[PDB]
């Protein structure tokens, strides 16, 4: 433990202790096997540097050490030596153009007037009072900027290649000491080298022994560590991959360690090589595959998972179905499957391996986590720990599987069960009891700062809040600089938490300035800021989105409590921000969470009208999206039976209050009808009679008065189109959705025309006569804006032109009349081809313009098309 001590002096002394000859052996391999013993959990964050330092400083006394690395210089140039100044100064700091002698000292008198002498020391003392003041001011800069070089730096008119071996192994050690990723590379390389050159020295009998010794030692490493410093965990695995027979590292141990260390991929490769190599005789080897499954689930690549379990290797198909569900984020169905899985009484073909149960549990806990059923979360997180019904939470720190798999969810559960509303005091008891024992304390303080911070803040002890959250910021810095640069997905999962930390920091700092407490302006300031700062929508998982939503909720509750002697404004933010969370969840295909949040936030619909229309809009949007995924017959229930009813404007004159809604709601009703009609046409043979009563009863009312069989679909589409038209005429009132609404009407027309070309509907075509006219005159109208998605489908234009010839004139006279020619250059080729046949009257003016403006584009395709 001393090997890291704060004083540099004792650092050197203890290290020199441990490097003397009789303590660690003097040859290399005996050193490498020894350093495994020089480790403890607490020496971790430096252990890599320490090992490197030991190894190299034994290199230091080898005979080639002063022998220059390259025998000859590269010229005859004369070489000088110059020192570098380095006087606690940087570069942008100075403004530009400025003994029988000694016996003699006994010849002294002494001031006699103690008053005078007293004044003399008094002034002297104020002099040192100022001197100490300035030296304290300067010593901070001096601690920052003190730099010690490490080699000679001979100068010559050419490079001084002839550097002593020292001149490279010593700097390398310096860097290794000071930064840990270079430590990982150095230790990894050097360990690989030593264990590779061991061949030329010891027979296979010895090699088996030393390799087994390392394997034991490394398994100890991983299984005993608590800090989970990403570099060391990575280094140990990375060593293990590039040598055989280190590869049988305890699969569970590696899995847990990598899950925690946020450095998954190296672990994936470890277990990968394990699988392929140790089995080029137990066929299944479940204990490895399943933990690989755990890893790939971490890295979020549910795609590869689909491979592992469909191999008839041990695992049971219940897990397969669970995975298929949970890939589509249908986390509710996933939970149901898993819960039924873990509670199977008797199996066919053998009970699930010790490890499949583990994976099942972890997936259960996580699957709940993606959900808002956090009471269920806590119950799951606590049940397995002990025997009696009122759970002895203290047991969690007993044996490691819980410590790594059950804890984090336990603590996160209890935290929010607190921070939402109110609850008991289990967690305060738990954490307080925990925070006695040493390793006990270290786990919480190093990993879970962001949670202990909120816990303590609930108790209104702001000071401990500051300490913990500062620790969290430092911890993030340390465990982020550590993560190797290439692992983007890892670093991303890191950053997703800086928002949490900063939010906590801001609240603490906001309940610290009573000047910002008693007024009212800066509450508005903070509310406005949080209103428009959000996590990334399409990327950041909902397990952080809920973190920000709930944190902010609690913090507003506390601020409201402070400013009791407003609530309008706080409610406003709560509406808006939770609504944004629903919108997000809608994007991520995390539907069940969206269900729950809608249902939790409807009761706030009754209030003034903008939130009413917003809620109804969002719910219908979500219903549409849910329908898109699944359901073919019953899906009509998923929209029609409710969404039609809800969307009715009888509850809202807000269109008379604003126009944005007067676009949004209409497009919503449009798409509402659209899927209805699409699926009704899908397999009409078994819909109206299968949704036999109430939906059907609604259908004709939604359709036309005549209850005819086939014509009901057209009755739908007719009002559908007129409604989408209402949407567009809404759009023409001042890209937000207008490009999208335009494209939307486009798409309705497109599908309808495609369907029409496969049959003969005289009346539907007669009312269709508008459809192509609009598709051209309006889609191309939309092509003016960037409209990338539109610009792509421009061949659909020309084809529409051809097959439906009478209304070409609109094309020319309307929009090719106004196209920005480049927005056709993209595939100028096709129409310059089409430039012969009768419709060529179409591209005429466009090809002319692009010819003039950007001639060199047309030439190459045009020259060939000329021949035809």
């Amino acid at each position: 433990q001393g090997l890291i001590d704060e004083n540099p002096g004792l650092q050197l002394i203890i290290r020199n202790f441990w490097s003397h000859e009789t303590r660690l052996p003097s040859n290399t391999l005996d050193r490498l096997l020894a350093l495994n013993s020089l480790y403890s959990p607490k020496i971790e964050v430096h252990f890599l540097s320490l090992a490197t330092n030991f190894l190299l400083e034994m290199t230091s006394m080898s005979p080639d050490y002063p022998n220059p690395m390259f025998e000859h210089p590269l010229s005859e140039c004369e070489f000088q030596e110059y020192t570098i100044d380095s006087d606690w100064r940087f570069r942008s700091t100075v403004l530009t153009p400025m003994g029988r002698t000694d016996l003699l000292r006994l010849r002294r008198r002494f001031m006699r007037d103690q008053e005078k002498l007293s004044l003399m020391y008094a002034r002297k003392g104020v002099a040192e009072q100022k001197r100490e003041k300035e030296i304290k001011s300067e010593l901070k800069m001096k601690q920052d900027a003190q730099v010690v070089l490490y080699r000679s730096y001979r100068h010559g008119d050419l490079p001084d290649i002839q550097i002593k071996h020292s001149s490279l192994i010593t700097p390398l050690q310096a860097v290794a000491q000071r930064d840990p990723i270079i430590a990982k590379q150095l230790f990894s390389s050097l360990f690989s080298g030593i264990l590779k050159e061991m061949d030329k020295f010891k027979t296979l009998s010895e090699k088996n022994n030393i390799t087994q010794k390392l394997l034991q030692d490394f398994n100890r490493f991983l299984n005993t560590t608590f800090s989970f410093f990403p570099p060391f965990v990575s280094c140990i695995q990375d060593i293990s991959c590039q040598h055989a027979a280190l590869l049988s590292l305890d699969p569970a141990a590696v899995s847990a360690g990598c899950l925690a260390s946020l450095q998954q991929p190296v672990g994936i490769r470890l277990l990968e090589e394990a699988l392929l190599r140790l089995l080029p005789r137990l066929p299944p080897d479940v204990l490895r595959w399943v933990e690989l499954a755990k890893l790939y689930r971490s890295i979020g690549e549910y795609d590869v998972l689909r491979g592992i379990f469909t191999s008839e290797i041990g695992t049971k198909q219940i897990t397969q179905s669970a995975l298929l569900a949970e890939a589509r984020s249908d986390y509710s169905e996933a939970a149901k499957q898993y819960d039924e899985a873990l509670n199977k009484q008797d199996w066919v073909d053998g009970e699930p391996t010790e490890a499949e149960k583990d994976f099942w549990e972890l997936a259960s806990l996580d699957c709940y986590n993606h959900l808002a059923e956090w009471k269920s979360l806590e119950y799951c997180s606590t049940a397995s720990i002990d025997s009696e019904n009122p759970p002895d939470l203290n047991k969690i720190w007993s044996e490691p599987f819980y410590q790594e798999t059950y804890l984090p969810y336990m603590i996160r559960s209890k935290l929010k069960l607190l921070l939402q509303g109110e609850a008991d005091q289990s967690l305060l008891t738990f954490i307080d009891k925990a925070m006695h024992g040493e390793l006990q304390k270290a786990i919480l303080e190093l990993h879970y700062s962001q949670e202990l911070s909120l816990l303590y803040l609930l108790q209104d002890d702001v000071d401990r809040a500051k300490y913990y959250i500062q620790n969290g910021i430092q911890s993030f810095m340390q465990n982020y600089s550590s993560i190797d640069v290439l692992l983007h997905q890892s670093r991303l999962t890191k950053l997703q938490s800086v928002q949490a930390l900063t939010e906590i920091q801001e609240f603490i700092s906001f309940i610290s300035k009573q000047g910002n407490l008693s007024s009212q302006v800066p509450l508005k300031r903070l509310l406005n800021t949080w209103t428009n700062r959000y996590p990334d929508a399409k990327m950041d998982p909902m397990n952080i989105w809920d973190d920000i939503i709930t944190n902010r909720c609690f913090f507003l509750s506390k601020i409201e409590e402070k400013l009791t002697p407003i609530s309008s404004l706080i409610r406003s933010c709560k509406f808006s921000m939770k609504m944004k969370m629903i919108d997000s969840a809608r994007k991520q295909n995390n539907f069940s969470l969206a269900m729950k949040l809608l249902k939790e936030l409807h009761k706030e619909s009754k209030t003034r009208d903008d939130w009413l229309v917003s809620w109804v809009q969002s719910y219908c949007r979500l219903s549409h999206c849910r329908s898109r995924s699944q359901g073919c017959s019953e899906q009509v229930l998923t929209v029609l039976k409710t969404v039609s009813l809800l969307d009715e404007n009888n509850v809202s004159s807000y269109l008379s209050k604003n126009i944005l809604a007067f676009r949004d709601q209409n497009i919503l009703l449009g798409t509402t009808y659209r899927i209805i009609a699409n699926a009704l046409s899908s397999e009409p043979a078994c819909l109206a009679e299968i949704e036999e009563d109430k939906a059907r009863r609604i259908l004709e009312l939604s359709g036309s008065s005549s209850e005819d069989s086939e014509k009901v679909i057209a009755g739908l589409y007719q009002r559908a189109f007129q409604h989408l038209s209402e949407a567009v005429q809404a759009a023409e009132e001042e890209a937000a959705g207008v490009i999208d609404a335009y494209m939307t009407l486009a798409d309705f027309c497109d599908q309808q025309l495609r369907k029409e070309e496969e049959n003969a509907s005289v009346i539907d075509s007669a009312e269709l006569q508008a459809y192509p006219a609009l598709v051209v005159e309006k889609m191309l109208k939309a092509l003016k804006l960037n409209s990338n998605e539109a610009r792509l489908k421009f061949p659909r234009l020309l084809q529409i032109i051809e097959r439906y010839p009478e209304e070409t004139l609109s094309l020319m006279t309307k929009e090719i009349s106004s196209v920005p020619c480049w927005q056709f250059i993209s595939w100028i080729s096709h129409m310059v081809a089409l430039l012969d046949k009768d419709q060529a009257v179409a591209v005429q003016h466009s090809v002319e313009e692009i010819t003039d403006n950007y001639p060199q584009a047309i030439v190459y395709p045009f020259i060939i098309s000329s021949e035809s």
Partner: peptide, 12 residues
């Protein structure tokens, strides 16, 4: 559906 569990013994 309610979420239920039971204890487990780790065989080590």
């Amino acid at each position: 559906a309610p979420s239920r569990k039971r204890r487990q013994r780790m065989q080590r």
